Design a protein around this motif. Structure first.
Motif, PDB file in Angstrom:
ATOM      1  N   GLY A  58       0.604  -0.661  -0.278  1.00  0.00           N
ATOM      2  CA  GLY A  58      -0.011  -0.286  -0.222  1.00  0.00           C
ATOM      3  C   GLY A  58       1.070   1.298  -0.168  1.00  0.00           C
ATOM      4  O   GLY A  58       1.828   0.844   0.590  1.00  0.00           O
ATOM      5  N   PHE A  59      -0.073   1.832  -0.149  1.00  0.00           N
ATOM      6  CA  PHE A  59       0.688   4.035  -0.106  1.00  0.00           C
ATOM      7  C   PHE A  59       0.120   4.692   0.985  1.00  0.00           C
ATOM      8  O   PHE A  59      -1.174   4.484   1.102  1.00  0.00           O
ATOM      9  N   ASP A  60       0.547   5.945   0.804  1.00  0.00           N
ATOM     10  CA  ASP A  60      -0.278   6.890   1.684  1.00  0.00           C
ATOM     11  C   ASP A  60       0.848   8.641   1.018  1.00  0.00           C
ATOM     12  O   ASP A  60       2.068   8.274   0.710  1.00  0.00           O
ATOM     13  N   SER A  61      -0.196   9.379  -0.109  1.00  0.00           N
ATOM     14  CA  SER A  61       0.549  10.413   0.576  1.00  0.00           C
ATOM     15  C   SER A  61       0.594  11.733   0.586  1.00  0.00           C
ATOM     16  O   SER A  61      -0.289  13.335   0.636  1.00  0.00           O
ATOM     17  N   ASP A  62      -0.888  11.795   1.846  1.00  0.00           N
ATOM     18  CA  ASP A  62      -1.397  12.626   2.704  1.00  0.00           C
ATOM     19  C   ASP A  62      -1.530  12.097   3.731  1.00  0.00           C
ATOM     20  O   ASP A  62      -1.623  11.218   4.445  1.00  0.00           O
ATOM     21  N   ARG A  63      -0.965  13.785   3.901  1.00  0.00           N
ATOM     22  CA  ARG A  63      -0.146  13.151   5.551  1.00  0.00           C
ATOM     23  C   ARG A  63      -1.116  13.329   7.079  1.00  0.00           C
ATOM     24  O   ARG A  63      -1.540  12.904   7.486  1.00  0.00           O
ATOM     25  N   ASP A  64      -2.588  14.022   6.153  1.00  0.00           N
ATOM     26  CA  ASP A  64      -3.210  13.761   8.001  1.00  0.00           C
ATOM     27  C   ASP A  64      -4.403  12.183   7.449  1.00  0.00           C
ATOM     28  O   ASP A  64      -4.912  12.178   8.425  1.00  0.00           O
ATOM     29  N   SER A  65      -4.013  11.816   6.614  1.00  0.00           N
ATOM     30  CA  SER A  65      -4.322  10.269   6.383  1.00  0.00           C
ATOM     31  C   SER A  65      -3.436   9.278   6.385  1.00  0.00           C
ATOM     32  O   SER A  65      -4.204   8.260   7.415  1.00  0.00           O
ATOM     33  N   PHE A  66      -2.714   9.400   6.424  1.00  0.00           N
ATOM     34  CA  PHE A  66      -1.607   8.640   7.087  1.00  0.00           C
ATOM     35  C   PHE A  66      -1.400   9.142   8.758  1.00  0.00           C
ATOM     36  O   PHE A  66      -0.880   7.874   9.339  1.00  0.00           O
ATOM     37  N   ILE A  67      -1.261  10.263   8.730  1.00  0.00           N
ATOM     38  CA  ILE A  67      -0.412  10.224  10.342  1.00  0.00           C
ATOM     39  C   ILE A  67      -2.187  10.849  11.136  1.00  0.00           C
ATOM     40  O   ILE A  67      -2.105  10.593  12.471  1.00  0.00           O
TER      41      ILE A  67
END
Ligand SMILES: OC[C@H]1O[C@@H](O[C@H]2[C@H](O)[C@@H](O)[C@H](O)O[C@@H]2CO)[C@H](O)[C@@H](O)[C@@H]1O
Ligand SMILES: OC[C@H]1O[C@@H](O[C@H]2[C@H](O)[C@@H](O)[C@H](O)O[C@@H]2CO)[C@H](O)[C@@H](O)[C@@H]1O
Lengths: 809, 809
Positions: B203-212
């Motif tokens: 998987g991945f994440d590129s939005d800070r508010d979604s990952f953190i």
């Protein structure tokens, strides 16, 4: 939703601490200002967020909104915060009340309740925090209270960039229950800060690394974890202020404390009590001013009276409680706050700027002129004093120095007209024509000073003299839309779109400026007639008529008004364009200027606006959005679609469409546009809006954005003033006018009526409007004190009495 | 102690993560640069920390050093970080090895070991991170690996101040295992960044508010807490890059991964693969370049060989292992790093500046000239090209644009002499006189170009033409001491002490500039004689003798040398002053000029320096410290006592005192001064020093400070170059000179001898120094290749062979 409106107390009550974003409030009226969030985050400053910042704050932090006025309750190993931040341990109850100039935060854990009221008292250079600690449990408790603030080094940019010097400059003094921050007081600063409490303390801390620890965060400072203060004295690095008090509470017993964040300026001669010891006399006086809860309560009541008097000039009684709370409380409050704060500090404006827009300063006056007429007059004179001899204006006004920014410069060709509009609004509100005869300098130069009316004349003829090939005004660097840069043609990433010009600016025209010219030339002609200048009024009317003909011949696309011509002489905002076939600014200002009223062009343009720009969350700036960079347009196409000026919802220019809808007599459309962006009507989708549900924001994501409906840049915008003008004057029909109060409502047909109590030129008018035959516009009868009058202009009494006005549509 | 030196691997090994301050290392050689701490904090940039910053970093954060290359191991609910940060869960084992251009970080928890090697390969625009995951337990494990970086918006100042626009500009693409950051690529920018891994991701994440999460920190991101990626696509706000990989490890089984942070520039015509899709060809090539561990190992070995070749021109074999590790590894490494990085980015320099000091570049050249002579020649010509026609220099040099800062300006009257000193050092090192005949522009203007020797002539005669009332050089805005501002007289905060001048600058003189003039005029006279200008050499010698007489008549206080005269014409650094009776700069540079050797004045001044300025941690700038603000002195008195220029230990001028001690033939005193500030000798008081124990810092708190012994502003200073020159040339006696290599050691008497292998002008000299009679100074015999020579200058061979030299004292 995340809370509710408390109208009787004029508060917004936030019930859960995890709002979609931190929701903030402003404290202070004249010089000391505080930004405080619902978890007590934020900071304070004295008159200048850039050069006199008192406490440190980190923007765009992880986690968000860390740093503020932090109280820690330590109970037998456990510890927590009343605002739930920074500790973030679950509370039995949490509440934040954002009021007018004050914020209350209450939190409870393990039978201990902590309530803190933050406010800046009138004529006081400090933030006062009243803290109540209550034992609601059944057992006697022994706890420790910790206060905490983090100081800034007075210069935010230097504070965040210049560590190579400023890690060695931080200095404090500790005496009694007061911690004084005095960095650079030894050399050139004559000011210091202090943090005090009105009780004997058990301990203190002034070094950040001692109170917190190098590898610890705000959520668990090592001194709070250990339950006792380290009594550290700061030496460089990061000065802070922290008191610790050991408290025994019997069941049902409460204790009260007053914490003060204060700012002191000394005379250069009276800087020292002795060698190396600052003079604390003013701080002693300030602290004694609020050493009991009774004095704090008196100051709180006085602040309440001040805000109530500020809000009492326009009072609406209608069937809509959301409309009532918008008109009576929150819109006027936001207008006053926007006058007090300019565009300096928010949670989106970082406080490093030097001033606000000249046009924004003029436009806010329309919002707040009915509340503070004398300050509005002074502001108008100050703004006019910075005008250049040719009639142009500095793009950025600096209210702190009362001067224009020479580095930014001029050549935003819509700027001078806003001065005429604001002066006309002031005169229509007050009836005070004497402002026209004041001697105002040019370029802040007393040697070259003329009348204020001469300043307005130069503003008018700056547009008259800078006409383009089609007779429309030359746009210059930009117009109201700061991202429409038709003379820039920039290929280099780091240059400003607004001040870089690679074209001579002799081709690109703006029809939005043309509509503004036609709309404001009526006021200019009226002021020409008042001054006794008949030939000047005739010549101005000739120019206005020529502009109207130019708009009809070259500014209309067939079903809506064009937006501009570019440096190639190509139409901007035309159906022949691939993207951006229709813009919103030209439609609003051209219909407001009454162009196209008889031939159906205005109605066609408003229908096109509804067809192409309407969304459930407001009206987008242009359609279709730009999907690539256009070098000939400037900054507008640099945004992704649906954000900011690239087809975002700019609530500032939705008010112009509301006014234009009132012009064609469609009150349902005007109120439907008003409701889509009014905060009280989107409180129920607060989770989508994501920002404060009690103030306007600058920008809402448009239909082309994936975050359609989300807001940015709240609390500091010209949206509040223009929307208040649209609702209170154009829809509700209470319009100031040169000869008096004009009544001309344009309302939804289903309304039965309403009433407005309006203070105007030394008298009060209780105006009851009725709609027996359910129409939108058209006044059938006006009665004043029982006697029918002719026309729709109310007589001026100036007698300090109340007069009943009865209006039948 | 918090670690140890590993000399065979040329590393410093940090064994505990809770180090007194984050200890950092630099990666990159030409264009891509990385700052990495011992917990993997820091950030990268491309040639410009100000305008091309790739990843975001917060200075002065709470907790410190949050943000970096963060790897999260998720094991059945538990999660941790190999650098112990940001999670800060205890590890079974932790280690950080800071090497030459690379950093290794190893962490172990619950039988899982993670080892990451970070380095920038040669000729590569990216940071490569090689990650080994090993199951050292007895059971099969199922884990998830998370990577994380936070992007910057390419302009750090804009990134931290302009949220009103840039919260709507962030853009990414996600393709395969690569996340591309492309903010403003749809616009004037032609560059992008990427984060890749050479394996299929879960998987991945590129939005800070979604990952953190909005209210979570780096220590517990919500995606890591849940053990699953959210697959979020960034849209404005904060773009980030994060991969997640699901791994099954058998007992004893290991997995290898390569993560790359890469930077790509495209041509404007090749920016797009299609509409809205960036061209990824260069990124594909870059990623394939290092898609296996073998290629990474080859690049790592190549970097090791490059750094070994850089340090191989001066090799010491003595009885002192600390001296050996300072001379052979760490001093030369710091000098090369300081050449690569200028003064842009450290943990104390925030990366927002525009350049470095002109004098600082000239002084660093002395440190690194023996390692990179060709680049030193190019740098000398570039610096000379910015010189003004009258011989003055721009105070700030900008190596990125190779131009001087016009806003800061000139009138720092010691600046031109450093150019002569650096050119003389280059000629002595290489023997290449042709640099004197190069055509160099003035003020970067090719129309007015002259020889380099003419530039040196103008530099020499700027001092001659700017003498004061006593015949000493006028100080101007300042001299080497940037905080001695005798023409400022500032009472207003927030104005520069260095560029604000309220005096004409015709009275205040500097004894330090006079000493520099006498010291460097010898080299200028030699260069005059090389060019065949006998009359010019005679006239220059006349001026030097006049300066020497002026120093003897007006620059000596009776027991030591004076510092300056102020605008009133009063002595600065005199026993008649109440505070600041003796400064350090004048003593060092006057004794180095050999002004009072015969009459005992130099020895008297050095004894005074020992008596009044000596501390266990180094020598303070002046004594006594200033305890109030002196308006006539400028910025020096604005610091609290014992910090920065107000009686702090500036290790830069301690080297001048060391050289002066070698001049009077006292080697024990010189080495005792050298040891007090050398990093390897204070590794044992690392807790007091608090900064990196393997590089020099700018400043150590003096005896008047409560933090006496604590360092600030490490890793980026002229201390490394001058201290290497002092130890390798003045104490060890291997001095480059016109006509060859001179041997003139000045060493502690108890030493039996040592050996230095020196690469010099195309040949290698193995010089064995012996001290059978235990003296400090004085050469009795020199033998080359078995034959005794006359004098102390070695013959030049230029044959690529090794020559044995025996020196008997
Ligand atoms: O365009 C309307 C509004 O623009 C404001 O300028 C902003 C602009 O919105 C933003 O896109 C750009 O990046 O920054 C500028 C600020 O310099 C302007 O301040 C307002 O007066 C104007 O009404
Ligand atoms: O004084 C020696 C050293 O000073 C450097 O200037 C610093 C100075 O140390 C600091 O006190 C002041 O606040 O900031 C300046 C930077 O602008 C200077 O850069 C060096 O060249 C000089 O050797």
């Amino acid at each position: 939703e995340f809370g509710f409106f408390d109208d009787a107390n004029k508060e917004y009550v936030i019930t859960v601490p995890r709002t979609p974003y931190p929701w903030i409030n402003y404290l202070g009226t004249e010089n000391f200002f505080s930004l405080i969030s619902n978890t007590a985050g934020g900071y304070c400053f004295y008159r200048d967020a850039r050069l006199r910042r008192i406490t440190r704050y980190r923007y765009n932090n992880v986690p968000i909104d860390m740093g503020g006025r932090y109280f820690y309750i330590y109970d037998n190993g456990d510890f927590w915060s009343p605002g739930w931040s920074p500790v973030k341990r679950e509370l039995e109850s949490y509440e934040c009340r954002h009021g007018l100039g004050y914020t209350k935060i209450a939190g409870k854990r393990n039978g201990i309740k902590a309530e803190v009221t933050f406010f800046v008292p009138l004529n006081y250079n400090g933030e006062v925090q009243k803290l109540i600690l209550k034992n609601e449990g059944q057992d006697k408790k022994k706890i420790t209270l910790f206060s905490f603030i983090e100081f800034c080094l007075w210069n935010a940019y230097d504070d965040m960039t210049n560590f190579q010097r400023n890690f060695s400059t931080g200095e404090v003094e500790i005496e009694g229950s007061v911690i004084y921050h005095k960095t650079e007081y030894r050399e050139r600063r004559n000011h210091y800060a202090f943090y005090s409490v009105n009780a004997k303390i058990s301990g203190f801390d002034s070094d950040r690394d001692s109170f917190i620890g190098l590898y610890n965060g705000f959520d668990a400072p090592q001194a709070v974890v250990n339950g006792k203060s380290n009594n550290s004295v700061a030496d460089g690095w990061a000065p802070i202020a922290s008191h610790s008090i050991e408290i025994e509470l019997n069941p049902g017993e409460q204790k009260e404390y007053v914490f003060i964040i204060g700012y002191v300026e000394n005379k250069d001669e009276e800087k020292w009590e002795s060698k190396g010891v600052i003079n604390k006399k003013k701080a002693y006086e300030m602290i004694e001013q609020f050493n009991t809860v009774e004095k704090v309560d008196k100051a709180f009541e006085e602040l309440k009276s001040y805000w109530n008097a500020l809000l009492s000039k326009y009072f609406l009684e209608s069937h809509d409680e959301k409309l009532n709370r918008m008109v009576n409380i929150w819109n006027q409050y936001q207008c006053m706050v926007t006058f007090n704060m300019s565009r300096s500090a928010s949670y989106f404006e970082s406080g490093i700027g030097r001033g606000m827009g000249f046009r924004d300063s003029n436009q806010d006056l329309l919002g707040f002129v009915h509340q503070i007429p004398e300050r509005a007059r002074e502001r108008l004179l100050d703004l006019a004093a910075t005008q250049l001899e040719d009639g142009s204006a500095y793009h950025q006004y600096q209210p702190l120095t009362k001067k224009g920014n020479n580095e930014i410069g001029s050549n935003f060709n819509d700027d001078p007209l806003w001065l005429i509009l604001a002066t006309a609004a002031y005169i229509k509100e007050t009836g005070d024509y004497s402002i026209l005869k004041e001697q105002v300098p040019f370029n802040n130069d007393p040697s070259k000073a003329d009348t204020m009316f001469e300043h307005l004349t130069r503003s008018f003829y700056h547009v008259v003299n800078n006409l383009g090939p089609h007779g429309l005004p030359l746009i210059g660097r930009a117009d109201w839309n700061d991202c429409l840069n038709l003379n820039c043609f920039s290929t280099v990433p780091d240059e400003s779109f607004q001040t870089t010009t690679s074209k001579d600016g002799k081709v690109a025209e703006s029809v939005m400026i043309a509509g503004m010219f036609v709309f404001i030339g009526k006021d200019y002609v009226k002021l020409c007639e008042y001054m006794g200048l008949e030939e000047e009024a005739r010549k101005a009317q000739q120019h206005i008529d020529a502009m109207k003909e130019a708009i009809l011949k070259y500014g209309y696309d067939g079903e809506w008004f064009l937006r501009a011509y570019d440096d190639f002489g190509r139409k901007v905002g035309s159906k022949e364009n691939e993207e951006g076939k229709i813009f919103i600014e030209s439609q609003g200002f051209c219909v407001m200027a009454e162009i196209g009223l008889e031939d159906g062009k205005a109605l066609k343009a408003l229908d096109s606006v509804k067809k192409y720009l309407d969304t459930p969350y407001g009206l987008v700036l242009q359609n279709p959005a730009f999907t690539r960079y256009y070098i000939e347009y400037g900054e507008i196409s640099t945004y992704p679609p649906g954000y900011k000026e690239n087809a975002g919802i700019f609530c500032h220019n939705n008010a112009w469409i509301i006014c234009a809808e009132t012009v064609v007599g469609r009150g349902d459309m005007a109120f439907d546009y008003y409701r889509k962006i009014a905060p009280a009507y989107i409180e129920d989708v607060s989770d989508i809006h994501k920002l404060e549900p009690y103030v306007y924001a600058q920008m809402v994501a448009g239909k082309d954005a994936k975050r359609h409906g989300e807001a940015k840049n709240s609390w500091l915008t010209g949206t509040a003033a223009w929307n208040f003008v649209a609702i209170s004057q154009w829809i509700l029909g209470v319009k100031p006018d040169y000869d008096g109060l004009k009544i001309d409502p344009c309302i939804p047909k289903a309304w039965d009526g309403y009433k407005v109590t309006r203070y105007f030129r030394g008298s009060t008018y209780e105006i009851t409007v009725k709609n027996p035959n359910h129409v939108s516009k058209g006044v059938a009868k006006i009665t004043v004190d029982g006697n029918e009058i002719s026309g729709n202009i109310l007589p001026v009494f100036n007698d300090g009495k109340t007069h009943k006005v009865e209006v039948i549509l």
